[PDB]
Amino acid sequence: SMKIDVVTIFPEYLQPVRQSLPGKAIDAGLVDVAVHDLRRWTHDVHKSVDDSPYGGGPGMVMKPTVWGDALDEICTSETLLVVPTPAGYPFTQETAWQWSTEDHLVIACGRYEGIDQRVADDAATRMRVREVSIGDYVLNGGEAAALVIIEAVLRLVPGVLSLLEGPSYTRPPSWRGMDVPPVLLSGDHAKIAAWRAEQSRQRTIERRPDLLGF
Amino acid sequence: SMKIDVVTIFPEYLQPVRQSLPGKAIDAGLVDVAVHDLRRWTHDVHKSVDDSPYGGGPGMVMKPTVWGDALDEICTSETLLVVPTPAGYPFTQETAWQWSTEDHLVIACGRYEGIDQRVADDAATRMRVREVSIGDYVLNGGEAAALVIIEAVLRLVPGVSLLEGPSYTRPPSWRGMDVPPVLLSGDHAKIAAWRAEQSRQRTIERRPDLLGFDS
Ligand SMILES: Nc1ncnc2[nH]cnc12
Ligand SMILES: Nc1ncnc2[nH]cnc12
Numbered sequence: 001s002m003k004i005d006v007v008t009i010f011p012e013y014l015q016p017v018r019q020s021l022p023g024k025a026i027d028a029g030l031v032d033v034a035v036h037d038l039r040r041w042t043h044d045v046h047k048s049v050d051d052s053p054y055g056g057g058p059g060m061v062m063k064p065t066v067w068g069d070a071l072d073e074i075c076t077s078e079t080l081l082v083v084p085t086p087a088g089y090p091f092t093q094e095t096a097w098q099w100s101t102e103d104h105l106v107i108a109c110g111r112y113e114g115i116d117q118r119v120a121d122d123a124a125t126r127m128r129v130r131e132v133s134i135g136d137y138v139l140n141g142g143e144a145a146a147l148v149i150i151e152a153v154l155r156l157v158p159g160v161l162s163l164l165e166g167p168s169y170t171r172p173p174s175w176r177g178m179d180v181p182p183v184l185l186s187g188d189h190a191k192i193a194a195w196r197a198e199q200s201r202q203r204t205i206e207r208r209p210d211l212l213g214f
Numbered sequence: 215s216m217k218i219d220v221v222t223i224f225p226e227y228l229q230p231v232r233q234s235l236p237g238k239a240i241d242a243g244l245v246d247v248a249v250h251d252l253r254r255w256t257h258d259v260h261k262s263v264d265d266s267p268y269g270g271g272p273g274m275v276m277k278p279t280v281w282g283d284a285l286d287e288i289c290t291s292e293t294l295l296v297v298p299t300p301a302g303y304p305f306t307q308e309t310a311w312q313w314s315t316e317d318h319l320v321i322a323c324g325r326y327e328g329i330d331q332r333v334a335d336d337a338a339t340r341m342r343v344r345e346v347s348i349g350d351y352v353l354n355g356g357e358a359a360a361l362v363i364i365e366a367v368l369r370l371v372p373g374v375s376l377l378e379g380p381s382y383t384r385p386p387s388w389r390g391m392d393v394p395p396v397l398l399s400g401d402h403a404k405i406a407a408w409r410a411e412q413s414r415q416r417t418i419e420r421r422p423d424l425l426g427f428d429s
Contacts, residue, residue: 013231013237055382055396087378087420096351114380135304138310140369144361144365168267168271169275175279175332196269207345
């Protein structure tokens with residue numbers, strides 16, 4: 001059974017919710033998710049987790065001594081350490097598939113300005129480390145990115161459940177002046193597949209022209 | 215202040231949390247976030263919100279009747295209706311900046327197989343509709359994408375390119391690993407040059423697309 005440890009300064013934000021796909025996976029015994037308050041590994045009364053960046057600049061950088069202790073305790077040699085960061089390699093469906101068969105994911109959630117690079121560099125000498133971005137936008141921290149990664153990965157674990165997908169329809173056949181495309185009701189399943197391919201092509205050209213090569 | 219309405223069959227999941235960035239924005243009176251259970255607009259015993267797809271295929275498609283009623287109540291002509299879908303236009307930083315000035319966002323969260331397309335088509339005859347993907351992966355539903363969109367947008371609300379290279383903080387040596395000496399030198403010019411170089415070098419390795427290269 002997969003183990004996922006999430007380390008964050010926002011533990012209640014990342015607490016699993018029963019009424020959700022990860023909540024369902026947990027209650028099904030298909031994953032164990034544990035959320036850890038990073039402050040647990042702080043050294044001082046202020047529970048300090050970041051510090052000013054060397055070289056100057058706005059924002060803060062998360063402390064290596066704090067993260068170092070947290071990961072020392074939580075990780076083992078089998079761990080895949082996931083570090084969400086907008087400077088990461090792209091997280092894709094392929095990645096989600098790879099991680100879905102891992103025994104132990106640890107997701108280190110930090111502010112977007114980053115965790116001191118030595119944490120990942122050190123960790124990588126003992127375990128596999130993956131710095132990943134979930135998209136071309138900036139979140140204040142990796143917390144919401146962790147939620148996305150967990151959702152994408154867990155729905156691929158057995159038992160939990162190119163081109164763009166085109167429009168989909170269901171009952172009633174007519175609604176507010178709009179009819180479901182009659183081909184879908186034709187019982188000509190080869191034709192339906194061809195029609196769906198064309199819908200997919202048109203939607204991809206319109207919304208994601210990057211996916212068509214060219 | 216900005217109003218965000220979220221419609222979902224997972225209200226508990228989407229409930230704002232005080233200790234979070236959106237929680238801070240709410241507490242500061244800079245945004246009002248309301249979460250609505252889609253089942254509120256069902257009429258049948260079983261509170262059904264989806265049905266098998268016309269034409270076949272896996273999973274289920276969300277009923278247009280239920281969504282139609284929900285949006286009729288929540289949306290006005292001024293609403294920007296956001297519909298997260300993996301089949302959507304890309305949601306980007308530019309999008310976040312644009313939506314940070316909107317008076318009213320409504321985020322319609324639905325399973326990935328889709329809300330019946332007639333819903334978005336109908337809505338578009340009355341208001342601005344934006345079907346958007348937050349990345350090239352599949353989530354079971356729009357819920358976690360809504361959380362991401364709310365995060366990306368609210369941090370840009372007043373009052374609340376290239377990849378950034380590595381960052382460092384104290385102490386200067388840790389487990390035998392030293393902070394790059396230029397960063398300790400106080401030479402703003404050399405530091406800026408070093409950071410620019412690290413940025414370009416990380417970008418070419420991790421995101422060559424950003425510099426107009428393949429992959
Ligand atoms: N786009 C992003 N991806 C992963 N982690 C992040 N933290 C802040 N923004 C992020
Ligand atoms: N990648 C994605 N972006 C937006 N909404 C989604 N719903 C399921 N997957 C999604």
